[PDB]
């Protein structure tokens, strides 16, 4: 689930997998990973 | 706000124009029904009337300030000795500390203990003065800088207690622990040897809700020493009987001889075994009595400056019942 | 450098406790921070002993 | 959460009666802002022991001043700040200034409002310190004991003091003191020889130790650490197979007796209800004349 | 008499650290985060070796929140004489609601303030748990990309 | 923490973290007249090779 | 006063489990107004008595917020009597209207609030009557002193409750108490004519079993049988004892419940207000 | 009874609890004490 506009450009070229666990979550791919192009969400249809 | 309470009484033993306002005050008992519970309470053995000659010998007064009782025990530094004598106003007042002094280690000899006959109320604000009667104030309830004292250069007020007996626990017992608000108890530390007797006072804080343990602990040698000689002077027979010996191997006997109710008297069940617990001169509790505490209030601070002195940290007076301590 | 953390304030908040007489304010302040940098972003040297 | 009473009108002469009462206690059932005169009323011929064990299922209330149409209680266990109050004295001697007062049934002999018009009874709990209610109590328990064996049946010496005057403890029999007591004194002196006897048992050999330097040192060494002499309590001989007739486990025993001291130790009162602070007034109330109390 | 010298975060040079912004809702924030997005470059090799598709990533980080406080007691007596409660009408009392006033400003003077000494502080107590030391960095930074 | 093998069950995924979290490490023992087990509640900033 | 717990950053698969425990009890061990949540924290259950001997050296506090930074408490009693908080109820049997409660540690464990991120587990302590409370006091001392739903004891601090109830038990023996000791019998047999009196007495009642089976002689006079009496110092010493006896082993009650308006029960895991004692 | 006008600044910022030797008299409240506000005095009244 990406953003679609982002805020600030990132202009460091730094390798990333060699950094793995600076941080909490991330998945990694090489192209057409079928999952990022599929829309959902969960809706509410009626408040009573 | 706080509640305070008034007392017109004698100028005898807490003296308000003497100390500044700020320490606590006790009310002391009617002498005449510790005088009466004596004939009964005294154990076998000692002197029955000692007490109420321990008393005639002092001759209504209901006051005393704590300031003037620690004076007369063993437990104190004799600058506040020197203080009590030389600075309070009042004639004969050295000879009245001796006879008190007496006075206390009489009670403890009659096995009436002093804390049946000092209950506390809070510390003193105001008075007005006769000429040898006066009317002490003291809060009840509350803290103690939420009253309105009439000196005009301290409107509110502390609360002071001799640091000659200021015992602290904690800090004592190493728990290790880190200071935040901690109890206030006012405990009395008997000791009984016919004729050689005394009395300590302390004034204990600490975060422990239930003293117990702590005080069998920090008083082992008194309670050591106190429960071989106590029992002294009381006749104890010979050898014990060895009928004494509880039988328990008769319980679940299935064979053994028995006996239904409604027929003992005198019937032909002469073959029941013979017991006869005999206990005529042991310890009793009272005898290994050697300690007393009651509640105080809530306290944050203690800072010791002067005579020296111990200045409490907002001080939340609420007094609580009293509490044997003998185990 | 130029921006290593992402540092937000929130709002002053006061506890007025009143207790014994006198008030005893409280006061508090929560902030949170976070990093931005992929790549370490900082380093010590423990020049002196 | 002051509550008021509905009063079935009476009528002249007896309301008078009503309104001399405005400073004793009522034990009400529930805090509701609404209650009937029938709800808070015993028998004023009763068993001591019951009620006193009732007394804690309750709330404690004092009767602030009373109407024709109704009278207004204020209850003591819950409240703000634990404002004041005042409070008729009632017990059989007076109380001091500074101490603490303690709600025991009427263990001597009784008084009680008999209100004939409206055909109920109210029973009005007596107001004692703290000390000389816990010597009293065990006063009369001691002289129905005594009694009991058939001994001697006087020694002159069932007497109390306060402040100076000699009470006399009024004779054992005034309305029902042979009756309305005998349940208190059974069950205390049956529980205090069951504990004798279960510790005895435990320990079979503790009164034939040295008459001044075995059980001394005995007591001494078990109030100070881990020594215990080994096994102290030797180990009981084992029961039956439950069944046969005669089966006796000691320690569902002990269980059973600790169980049973407890719960006789917690209906007894002696936790104070209040504290006397009186303030402008003479320090010492006698009996039946207010005094200020604040709650404690 | 003695003068507390003030001291604004701002004005120093730690501030070229970090972004500092207003969030004045930030008591009724639960977890937050940001996002990272990135895309190495790639070199098209041949012979044996074979060749690569780029690689893509897409990666979270979580707030860290933490609370600073100061206590500011004040007194009974100087309370009811800032009031009117205790004043009295003399020429000496107001002599002393001067005072109790002047010392009640001196003393906000001094507590609001340490709110920056505060950050100032915690900036460097965040910094430097972050760094790692540098020997231990500056060889790792030579075998990346090999740590295969 | 030569003989304790249950970081390993806290497994490592990056030698990254391997080497942030030497110098980020809570101290283990005390300020006090001897070395005593620290408690681990209030947390110290300590760094080891 | 009101005593502020810090929290760590947590993950909402168990903060959203933390908000539900509104009505609870922790326990503290300095009444500091700050404090981090790591600190006021118990192992996972073990030996019932030992926690049980435990709560009596540590003052309790209630929790009443918890937002996603602070969770507030407040100290139980210190100085208070009257301050009308909530606490919910999690012990089985339910607490009625006008009882106290009394504050007891779990059984068979299994009620561990076990936080994964924080690496750590809360015991909050069930809640029950009085009466109730008495009773299972009673049975772990007594099955302690068996040993020379049910865990088993450790042998190393079972010695101390029994230590206690020994000593408390000891000091019951007096000289007066020899006397009451007399009329075992003569209790017996007033125990025949009626029937209340016949009631008091129980049925495994570790005296009957004695009375029926050994005969005791007259007692011997004490000394200065004129001047005292002691069966009245005995029974003043044993109403002394027995009004401080359940407390010792188990806890003083700490609450008692009153409702104004709601159902007189409560049933468990439901609010119900209360006021401190 | 402190004094009600200062005569001239004071400079060094430095804590004090630890130089207390120099001083002959020292007193450290923690914040705002309530004792510092009372002031009586001593009078006469009327010479003849």
Same mark, same amino acid.
């Given at each position: 689930?990406?953003?679609?506009?982002?805020?600030g450009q990132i202009l460091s070229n730094i390798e990333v997998h060699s950094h793995r666990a600076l941080f909490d979550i991330f998945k990694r791919f090489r192209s057409d990973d079928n999952n990022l192009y599929g829309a959902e969400f969960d809706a509410l249809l009626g408040t009573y | 706000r706080a509640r305070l309470i008034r007392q017109v009484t004698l100028a005898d033993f807490c003296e308000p124009q003497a100390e500044r306002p700020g320490l606590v005050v006790l009310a002391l008992r009617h002498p005449a029904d510790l005088a009466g519970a004596a004939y009964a309470a005294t154990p076998p053995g000692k002197n029955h009337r000692d007490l109420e000659e321990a008393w005639l010998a002092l001759d209504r007064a209901s006051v005393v300030s704590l300031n003037f009782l620690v004076a007369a025990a063993e437990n104190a530094d004799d600058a506040l000795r020197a203080h009590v004598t030389t600075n309070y106003r009042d004639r !004969?007042?050295?000879? !009245?500390?001796?006879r008190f002094a007496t006075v206390l280690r009489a009670m403890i000899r009659s096995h009436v203990f002093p804390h049946r006959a000092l209950h506390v109320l809070g510390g003193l604000l105001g008075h007005v003065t006769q000429d040898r009667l006066a009317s002490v104030t003291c809060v009840a309830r509350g803290d103690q800088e939420a009253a309105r004292t009439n000196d005009m250069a301290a409107r509110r007020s502390q609360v002071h207690v001799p640091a000659c007996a200021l015992m602290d626990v904690d800090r004592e017992l190493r728990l290790g622990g880190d200071d935040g608000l901690r109890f206030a108890y006012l405990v009395f530390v008997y000791t009984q040897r016919h004729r050689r007797e005394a009395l300590r006072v302390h004034v204990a804080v600490s975060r422990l809700p239930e003293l117990g343990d702590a005080l069998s602990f920090l008083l082992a040698g008194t309670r050591v020493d106190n429960a071989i000689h106590g029992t002294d002077e009381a006749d104890a027979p010979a050898a014990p009987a060895a009928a004494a010996a509880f039988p328990a191997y008769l319980f679940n006997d299935p064979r053994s001889a028995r006996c239904p109710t409604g027929r003992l008297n005198t019937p032909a069940a002469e073959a029941l075994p013979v017991w006869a617990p005999d206990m005529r001169g042991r310890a009793t509790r009272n005898s290994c009595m050697y300690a007393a505490y009651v509640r105080l209030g809530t306290v944050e601070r203690v800072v010791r400056r002067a005579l020296p002195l111990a200045h409490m940290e907002r001080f939340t007076w609420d007094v609580g019942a009293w509490e044997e301590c003998f185990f | 450098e130029k921006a290593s953390e992402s540092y937000f304030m929130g709002q002053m908040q006061v506890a007025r406790t009143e207790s014994g007489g006198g008030l005893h304010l409280q006061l508090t302040q929560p902030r949170a921070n976070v990093d931005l940098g992929v790549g370490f972003t900082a380093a010590y040297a423990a020049a002196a002993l | 959460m002051e509550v008021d009473i509905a009063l079935p009108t009476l009528s002249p002469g007896d309301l008078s009666a009503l309104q001399r009462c405005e400073g004793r206690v009522v034990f009400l059932e529930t805090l509701r802002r609404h209650a009937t005169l029938r709800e808070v009323a015993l028998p004023c011929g009763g068993d001591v022991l019951a009620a006193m064990a009732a007394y804690r299922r309750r709330f404690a209330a004092v009767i602030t001043r009373?109407?024709? *149409?109704?009278? %207004?209680? +204020?209850?003591? @266990?819950?409240?703000?700040? @634990?404002?004041?109050?005042? %409070?008729?004295?009632?017990?059989?001697?007076?109380? +001091?200034?500074?101490? *603490?007062?303690?709600?025991?049934?009427?263990? %001597?002999?009784d008084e009680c409002l008999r209100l004939t018009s409206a055909n109920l009874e109210l029973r009005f709990p007596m107001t004692l310190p703290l000390a000389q209610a816990r010597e009293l109590t065990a006063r009369v328990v001691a002289r129905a004991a005594e009694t009991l064996r058939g001994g001697a049946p006087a020694r002159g010496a069932d007497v109390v003091f306060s402040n100076g005057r000699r009470y006399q403890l009024p004779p054992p029999h005034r309305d029902n003191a042979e009756a309305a007591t005998r349940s208190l004194v059974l069950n205390m002196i049956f529980l205090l020889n069951e504990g004798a006897v279960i510790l005895l048992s435990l320990i079979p050999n503790l009164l034939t130790l040295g008459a001044q330097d075995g059980y001394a040192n005995a007591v001494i060494q078990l109030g100070s650490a881990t020594r215990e002499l080994g096994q102290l309590v030797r180990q009981p001989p084992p029961p039956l197979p439950q069944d046969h007739a005669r089966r006796f486990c000691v320690f569902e025993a002990l269980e059973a007796w600790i169980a049973s001291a407890?719960?006789? @130790?917690?209906?007894?009162? +002696?936790?104070?209800?209040?504290r006397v602070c009186i303030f402008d007034g003479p320090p010492t109330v006698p009996p039946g004349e207010k005094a200020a109390v604040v709650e404690v | 008499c =003695?003068?507390? =010298?003030?001291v604004r975060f701002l004005e120093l040079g730690l501030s070229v650290a970090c972004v500092c912004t207003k969030f004045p809702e930030l008591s009724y924030v639960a977890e937050g985060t940001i996002q990272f997005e990135v895309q190495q470059p790639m070199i098209a090799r041949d012979g044996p070796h074979p060749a690569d598709q780029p690689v893509h990533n897409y990666m979270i980080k979580r707030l860290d929140r933490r609370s600073l406080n100061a206590a500011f007691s004040i007194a009974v007596e100087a309370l009811g004489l800032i009031s009117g409660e205790n004043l009295?009408?003399?020429? &000496? =009392? =107001?002599?002393?609601?001067?005072?109790? &006033?002047?010392?009640?400003?001196?003393?906000?003077?001094?507590?609001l303030d340490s709110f920056e000494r505060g950050t100032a502080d915690q900036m460097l107590r965040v910094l430097m748990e972050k760094a790692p030391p540098l020997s231990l960095l500056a060889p790792f930074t030579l075998y990346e990309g090999r740590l295969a | 923490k030569f003989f304790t093998p249950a970081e390993a069950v806290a497994k490592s995924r990056g030698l990254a973290r391997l080497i942030a979290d030497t110098g980020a490490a809570a101290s283990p023992t005390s300020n006090g007249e001897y070395q005593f087990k620290r408690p681990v509640g209030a947390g110290e900033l300590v760094e080891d090779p």
């Open positions: 689930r990406p953003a679609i506009l982002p805020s | !004969r007042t050295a000879a !009245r500390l001796e | - | 009373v109407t024709p *149409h109704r009278m %207004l209680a +204020t209850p003591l @266990g819950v409240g703000g700040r @634990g404002q004041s109050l005042v %409070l008729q004295n009632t017990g059989p001697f007076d109380l +001091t200034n500074g101490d *603490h007062v303690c709600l025991v049934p009427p263990l %001597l002999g407890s719960r006789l @130790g917690d209906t007894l009162g +002696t936790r104070p209800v209040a | =003695s003068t507390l =010298s003030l009295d009408g003399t020429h &000496i =009392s =107001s002599a002393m609601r001067l005072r109790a &006033i002047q010392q009640l400003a001196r003393n906000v003077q001094a507590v | -």
